[PDB]
Amino acid sequence: AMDCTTGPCCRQCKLKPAGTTCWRTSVSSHYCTGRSCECPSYPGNG
Numbered sequence: 890a891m892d893c894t895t896g897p898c899c900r901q902c903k904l905k906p907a908g909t910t911c912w913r914t915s916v917s918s919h920y921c922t923g924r925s926c927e928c929p930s931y932p933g934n935g
Contacts, residue, residue, distance in 0.1 A: 899926030908935050 893902045897911045898921035907923025911934075920934040 894926035896926050897928040898922065 894904065895902075898905050898909060904924060904926050905921055907921065909921040911919035911921055911928040917930075919928050919931070921928075922935055
């Protein structure tokens with residue numbers, strides 16, 4: 890019970906604005922959700 894997602898789509902225990910990039914690169918193009926800091930394995934998001 891931390892109530893603070895970690896990893897990409899975050900910033901010091903604070904999720905990034907909805908519609909952010911999840912580490913742009915040629916390894917796996919992804920996006921952020923809006924109310925979380927998780928980077929699913931989907932081709933499209935947000």
